[PDB]
Design a protein around this ligand. Structure first.
Ligand SMILES: O=C(O)/C=C/c1ccc(O)c(O)c1
Lengths: 121, 121
């Protein structure tokens, strides 16, 4: 769910998840996808394409188990859908941290309705 | 559109509109409505109920004319729908400023999917 996703992003990046990524670019946080603005945005692009296959559970609302072990996100044992969900979230958290170097605050509260349509996943 | 709305909010409050009100509570900013969390949130509740009475214009993307005269938002003539839209946005901007006293930062980046369903407008 959003709780686990936010904790992952915080653990990896060290930044307030909602504040930095809740409305970043055309892809991060709320709503769907758009053409990515930068690398950080593209993380969330891959993120939401990863969600697409999870038709068996709710990426926003369904809780799952994971642990923070030796500064590594370790997805606990779940059902297939929740396990993949956890992996989706882990991947975007890592990706967001990897791309902090080009994080641009002008995208932080990006006006998403004016984003160009995204390619099919 | 979001541009005029954000500017109105800035002119009244005068806080960063996207930052304070882009994701506030269950009603402010993105997505639809939820059961309001406080007075600020209820401003946006009324705000979105106001949008439902519009007849063919796009609240998010349609530009319209207005001016900031003697520190008062004054909606330009435009066309009937755009003027109604402009009055919707003026109303929420004033209301947001009126309720700054009880603005709660805990709601600023509210996780909206866990909001309770709103009453019909
Ligand atoms: O982003 C932050 O870390 C805080 C920003 C901020 C800026 C002005 C305020 O009044 C406020 O409550 C919060």
């Amino acid at each position: 769910s959003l709780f686990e996703l936010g904790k992952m992003i915080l653990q990896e990046t060290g930044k307030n998840p909602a504040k930095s990524y809740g409305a970043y670019g055309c892809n991060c946080g709320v709503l769907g996808r758009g053409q990515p603005k930068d690398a950080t945005d593209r993380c969330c692009y891959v993120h939401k394409c990863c969600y697409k296959k999870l038709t068996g559970c709710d990426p926003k609302k369904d809780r799952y188990s994971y642990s923070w072990k030796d500064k590594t996100i370790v997805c606990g044992e779940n059902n297939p859908c929740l396990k993949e969900l956890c992996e989706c979230d882990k991947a975007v958290a890592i990706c967001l941290r990897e791309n902090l170097g080009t994080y641009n605050k002008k995208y932080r509260y990006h006006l998403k309705p004016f984003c160009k349509k995204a390619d099919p996943c």
